[PDB]
Subunit: 239 residues, 4 copies
């Protein structure tokens, strides 16, 4: 199978895109660890749920070491955990700003600074960061979120360079999804979601499996000459 | 299999990337028509060679109608045929300019103007154009080639919009390869090749199969929410 | 003045953006040669109209040599002449394709292959190519035009590299205008002007002077460290 | 003069690019406030130095209100304050991460959330964010910096949309400088400076004034139809 014998960590893996990615990987033979604040909303023999708060530095170290102790190595990392706290910038509170940067940007750093160097030392890995169409185009009411999702692209390019030093076969890429119905959209008015669908060339929102399949491509050796990239998976949207 | 029952046309399919893409498709259940000026340099039970000169408008129509007569429809098109005629712009001749625009840009139009609308009418298809790192960054000695490979991106985006009108599930994307070991690199001095490898994050040139696997991804329903995109497959190169 | 003592050639300089750019340059101390098929629709003490058909290679050389004989050198070149021949790809004729590629792509090459190397030899120059928002995003009914305006970006990057080799202070950039109210856009129904305007962040179309001021910036030493770039001047449009 | 009558705030205005921008604006008639942690290293009659720590939310409000009380309005904002704390990601400390995100991303938010809405309410303004070639390409040893300078592009696009709502003529853009000879770069070994220069098409590093001239263009009405953009001012660099 495509990921047979590979160990994959998925942050925010309890539901939504993270669930879809975990299941796609597990169906292709990966040993998957789905880390989340919440219990998994699903079961698969090759998905282990673990508690993970990507904002708790001490907790991230404990999670990382627990995975290494049990599974030996981490071949694939998907930095998928993410939140929104939307507001017009005129009204956005310090807490709305801080929380989004902490999960979506620092939380990516907190775990990658452990996993990525481990991949370099092992001479192999694939890291997939989850950006957003909002990071590529900006979006009203989302200065915090857009900063993080554009920021993830900066991390992606930097780490694609760094972790491939000294001949290490480590790739780092990002996926920038368009709009997919998950709980992250709970505060987004339906008028906007309908507008977003109409802005795609395919005239529709995406499904979680449509992101998972691209994540599977990038994690696998099929994408062996793809690194440093941000792949837009957005039905052709311009936002 | 990923392309079971699909009919795929690959221009420039006799060797190089076109051959690699044809074989990848053929191994995933597609019936492949490999169109080229030259005889195929390989065989496969699912690949049929046909004469195709993408610059001969009348011949392209004949080729197209022959494929439709045999198989009834075309589900996948890869516009891969391409040439170089390198020269500094200071010295480039009219013939060097004209030939490259004719194959690499008009040739893409000549066949796609038949296949793409047929996909739109059938309600389904996937078109993969082959750009180049040179279209994304430019390159010394290649203004003609760069114009065409950047031009192909304009075609890609336009057609991703046009052929998905009226609810048609037609996707159009481009692959921009970096430097891949094929015959098109015969004329490039070896010192420059070594330089090219060092410009990649992976510190190596690519193999044809590394492009073929991405072409397979895009042709398949795995890429169902990917359209209008140019995927760089270049080992992280900046040129 | 910003361009005092410089000699500038503007193709398509009889009206529209070409006229606005010519006048902006002429008001900043440049001697401007406005080349066009038609007579200039304006006059200025620093603008000389000359016949130029960018598609006639022999005539382009005659124009070039005439300008050099009179003016000694050309410091600035704006490759502005351009046309559309719109059609859905399914109906686009060979002539509609050919004419647009010949003016908008080959025409740029035809004059630049003389002027650019001359700037390099002289140790100084600035070239401004005119792309379009359509080259950046594609547009239904404009595959030919989109191919050319995306292709111009490939030319831009290539020439920025080539003409600055061996110590020459030659810069090459492009402007990608959004929808600008030239004679041609003045005819379109208001209902549709409103539509394009609504795709911009400023909720309006542009004026020709708004392109000219950017062309003045890039031609001038204010842009001395800007090369290889395509500047979108489009009110924040996503098309 | 180009900015006569306009009030401009420049963060990090005591030295480096901020100084160059402040002086360029002052020479074109702007009333300039240069905010910084330290005293200005220069004098000009139309530059007022003020204490500003962009990371102190409360102090930022006090600074903002002081400027409004004295000058009435803020027409132009340049978010230039920035720091580096370089480290390979494997060694980067939490403090190195935190400080760079706080200045380079949150600091931009802290002041813009006051100034930008004020521009929207006044119906006019121009905001210039300072990104970097590192935000566009990534760079080894600079994951924190790259995250922030890519993030600034996300902010730029978001605010170009938000602050122009309801017909307000507010533009938001970014400049991404290449390697510019400010104080730190002068101390790097000559071998390295030559290496960096060799990555540019012009084979040289930039001077601060070359950034300031672009900042002047964007602040001015010459850039009236430019918004949502990131302008690379890098000599044609690929990093
Ligand atoms: N659904 C979309 O339209 C869309 C579009 C673009 C990008 N994204 C991104 O996709 C990713 C996944 O989001 P989703 O749409 O599945 O949303 P979701 O809310 O359904 O799932 C997010 C998951 O991440 C978790 N999480 C939140 N904070 C965490 C923390 N501190 N530590 C560990 N886990 C944490 C949640 O508990 C949750 O299970 C996010 O990065 C999001 O920004 C989503
Ligand atoms: N190999 C690389 O490094 C690289 C990088 C980027 C892009 N590309 C491109 O990928 C494509 C394939 O190139 P390749 O590397 O396999 O080169 P190649 O020279 O090995 O193969 C090209 C094939 O196209 C065919 N062809 C040429 N003109 C034709 C015409 N008028 N009609 C029909 N067929 C024609 C050739 O006969 C040949 O079989 C090209 O578009 C090329 O520009 C290659
Ligand atoms: N106006 C817009 O909204 C817009 C947007 C994006 C790009 N553009 C581009 O800006 C440029 C200027 O367009 P415009 O709106 O001013 O159009 P225009 O039609 O008003 O003017 C074009 C001028 O180019 C000249 N020209 C055409 N073919 C020529 C040839 N073979 N040789 C010499 N001159 C020739 C014409 O005679 C004419 O004077 C074009 O490249 C156009 O594609 C325009
Ligand atoms: N010089 C370059 O090559 C280059 C390239 C790309 C981007 N940049 C960026 O340009 C900007 C200016 O850089 P520079 O080269 O002039 O650097 P610099 O270090 O010479 O000057 C930066 C100034 O911002 C200041 N500053 C730092 N923290 C602050 C805070 N909390 N509040 C207020 N002011 C603060 C400093 O006191 C200093 O005066 C930075 O954002 C930067 O990262 C510089």
């Amino acid at each position: 199978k495509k990921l047979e014998g590979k160990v994959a960590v998925i942050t925010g893996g309890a539901k939504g895109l993270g669930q879809a990615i975990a299941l796609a990987y597990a169906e292709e033979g990966a040993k998957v660890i789905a880390g989340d604040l919440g219990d998994l909303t699903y079961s698969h023999p090759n998905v282990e749920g673990m508690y993970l708060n990507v904002t708790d530095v001490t907790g991230v170290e404990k999670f990382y070491q627990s995975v290494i102790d049990k599974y030996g190595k981490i071949d694939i990392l998907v930095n998928n955990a993410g939140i929104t706290k939307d507001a017009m910038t005129r009204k956005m509170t310090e807490a709305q700003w801080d929380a989004v940067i902490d999960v979506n940007l620092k939380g990516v750093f907190n775990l990658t600074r452990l996993v990525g160097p481990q991949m370099q030392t092992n001479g192999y890995g694939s890291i997939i960061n989850i950006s957003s169409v909002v990071g590529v185009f900006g979006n009203i009411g989302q200065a915090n979120y857009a900063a993080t999702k554009a920021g993830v692209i900066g991390l992606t390019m930097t780490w694609a360079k760094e972790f491939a030093l000294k001949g290490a076969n480590v790739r780092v890429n990002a996926i920038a999804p368009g709009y997919i119905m998950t709980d992250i959209l709970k505060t987004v008015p339906q008028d906007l979601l309908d507008k977003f669908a109409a802005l795609t060339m395919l005239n529709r929102l995406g499904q979680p499996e449509e992101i998972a399949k691209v994540a599977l491509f990038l994690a696998s050796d099929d994408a062996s000459y793809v690194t440093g990239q941000t792949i837009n998976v957005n039905g052709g949207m311009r936002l």
